[PDB]
Amino acid sequence: KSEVAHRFKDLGEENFKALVLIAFAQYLQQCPFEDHVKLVNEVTEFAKTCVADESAENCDKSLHTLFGDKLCTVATMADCCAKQEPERNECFLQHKDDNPNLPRLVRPEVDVMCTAFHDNEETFLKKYLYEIARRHPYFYAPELLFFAKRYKAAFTECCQAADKAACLLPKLDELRDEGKASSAKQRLKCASLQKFGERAFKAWAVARLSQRFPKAEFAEVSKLVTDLTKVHTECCHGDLLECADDRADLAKYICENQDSISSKLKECCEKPLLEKSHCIAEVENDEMPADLPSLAADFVESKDVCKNYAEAKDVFLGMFLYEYARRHPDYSVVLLLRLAKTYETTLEKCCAAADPHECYAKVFDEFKPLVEEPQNLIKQNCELFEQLGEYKFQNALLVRYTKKVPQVSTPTLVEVSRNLGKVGSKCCKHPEAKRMPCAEDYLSVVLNQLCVLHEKTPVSDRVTKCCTESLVNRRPCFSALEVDETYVPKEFNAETFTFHADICTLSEKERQIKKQTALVELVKHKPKATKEQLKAVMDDFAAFVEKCCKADDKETCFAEEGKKLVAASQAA
């Protein structure tokens, strides 16, 4: 009874107040900061009355009831409040915006920010949680607390340091970059649960955890998957308090049972809570017993397989994925899942036909082309990555993917292609025994970010097709797409190819965005243009963007010479 009191007792006021602000800012994204803080405090003072007396005023109500009722004291969508629980919460989830119409979060001067932090400490943190949760409504809530704690620590020392700027900026860029990664990775976890089901998540966890805790028994990995699924099920459906509380329940059980799980968790468990759970998620793979028997025994070369399979199909298939994953930390998670269903298929087929053992004999030969295909793409794209730059490797993927799906909105095409290009620096560096999990599972995260940005205003049938068909075959589904022949080229708009002298005031990162954006509009205009025709026009831009930022008259340099640029760039 009194769940709000149970979660307040288990989390503490600070984390309770913080998580509720995230929950509110995630749902009602467009409501300003001060409005959300009003609701949070009104709930918190109400929670304290429940901790003091759990049977008192409305304390026995569900969390979704209290939160949804409270949320809708400002919500004017409006239709989402004629409904009851869970019907209201369900439509609160489906109304989450992966691209809220919110301004670009401009950063003030370091002296100005440091003043604000010292002005009000607690207010400055809430405004960090508010602007992140309202723009990433699928942000892992417990991680965002650890992000806030670290966002707090970055300002504590760098506002007290000699050169505040050189201390703070690289810390705020490191947090922002990893912050996006934590949202995009979590966005893929919430897609699986909501769009594909509980079993599609369990299969994901069994493979990844067995890769990371290879020495742990199957019964131990199944327990971890069960509790971890429940945690992300709560976080993906808006049950943030139960998600954060049960995520601590998980980290506790992991750390007091390290002997049965992993040897790499020693230091992770000596850390405080928000760092402990963050450490266990980021811990590297343990060593595999090395003395494991070949997998053919008990899944192929053994008899009574279709009797062990039929007897309990899910636990038997989990045992196969468990056994295959722990032996292969060099495989990507998606591959292991492909082999899980490929193995499951050949059982469904061969556990009915005459003499089962016959047709499932060399099922391991079906795995061979499945393993080769990503290795031949990662090896090839890594070769392409290193003969170009990272920025050039993005320009190549911009042309390659704008030709694949030219219906997709240009800002989404650019944003996704840049996140696609970042796999090179991140994973090509690693050896080929570490490349596949790094490279392909990261591309899975980037392609899901393309799905959700496209699912809002769908425009490309092939994007919808690949995104809805499956999770594990998404990467090859996009990898197989060729140049869209049917796409009618977009007409020449004089606005979309004219830069202005204000580009000389933008950062090198933002100036890349603008030049890279003009590349998409160029490919959408001449989708039959060759690599050498687009490089011949892309170089004319950067030279034009560089000579017209030093010329004493900048405005008239971007003019006239900016129309001597477009007329020359045409024909091809």
Domain boundary among the residues 484, 510, 533 is at: 484
In a domain, 572, yes or no: no
Pair (480, 377) in one structural domain: yes
In a domain, 107, yes or no: yes
Answer whether 136's CB lies under 8 Å from 183's CB. yes
Helical H runs in 28-120? Answer: 33-52, 63-71, 87-94, 110-119
Pair (172, 207) in one structural domain: no
Per-residue tokens: 215: 């020495």
Q: At what angle do helices 198-212 and 218-236 cross, to 10 degrees?
A: 130
In a domain, 569, yes or no: no
Give the number of residues written for the chain: 572
Coil, strand or helix: which one is 85?
A: coil
Instruction: Read off the CATH number of the domain in which 519 is found.
Output: 1.10.246.10
Q: At what angle do helices 198-212 and 333-350 cross, to 10 degrees?
A: 120
In a domain, 85, yes or no: yes
Residue that the structure tokens 């059982």 belong to? 347
Secondary structure element (H or E) that encloses residue 536, with its range: helix 531-547
Answer whether 449's CB lies under 8 Å from 187's CB. yes
Pair (341, 356) in one structural domain: yes
In a domain, 55, yes or no: yes
Domain boundary among the residues 167, 187, 207 is at: 187
Q: How many domains does the structure of the chain reveal?
A: 6
Pair (102, 91) in one structural domain: no
Annotated binding site for Zn(2+): 64, 237, 239
Sign of CA dihedral 508, 512, 518, 519: positive
Pair (530, 544) in one structural domain: yes
Pair (427, 497) in one structural domain: no
Q: E strands within 467-560?
A: none
Which range of residues forms the domain containing residue 43? 2-97
Answer whether 145's CB lies under 8 Å from 18's CB. yes
Counting other chains too, the contacts that 418-424 makes at CB distance below 8 Å and 24 or more residues apart are: 418/394, 418/513, 418/516, 419/184, 419/446, 419/449, 420/394, 420/446, 421/385, 421/390, 421/391, 421/393, 421/394, 421/397, 422/390, 423/381, 423/385, 424/381, 424/382, 424/385, 424/386, 424/390, 424/393
Pair (317, 300) in one structural domain: yes
Annotated binding site: 3, 10, 64, 230, 234, 237, 239, 242, 245, 249
Pair (66, 86) in one structural domain: yes
Resolution in A: 3.0
Annotated binding site for (4Z,15Z)-bilirubin IXalpha: 230
Answer whether 432's CB lies under 8 Å from 455's CB. no
C-alpha distances out from residue 277 to 143, 258, 472, Å: 8, 14, 27
Pair (395, 451) in one structural domain: yes
In a domain, 314, yes or no: yes
Sign of CA dihedral 448, 451, 455, 457: positive
Sign of CA dihedral 503, 509, 510, 514: positive
Annotated binding site for Ca(2+): 3, 10, 234, 239, 242, 245, 249
430: left (phi over 0), alpha (psi -120 to 50) or beta: beta
Per-residue tokens: 514: 């603008």
- The alpha carbon of residue 118 and the mean position of all alpha carbons in its chain are separated, in whole angstroms, by 33
Pair (149, 212) in one structural domain: no
In a domain, 222, yes or no: yes
Answer whether 221's CB lies under 8 Å from 240's CB. no
In a domain, 268, yes or no: yes
Pair (357, 380) in one structural domain: no
Domain boundary among the residues 422, 456, 484 is at: 484
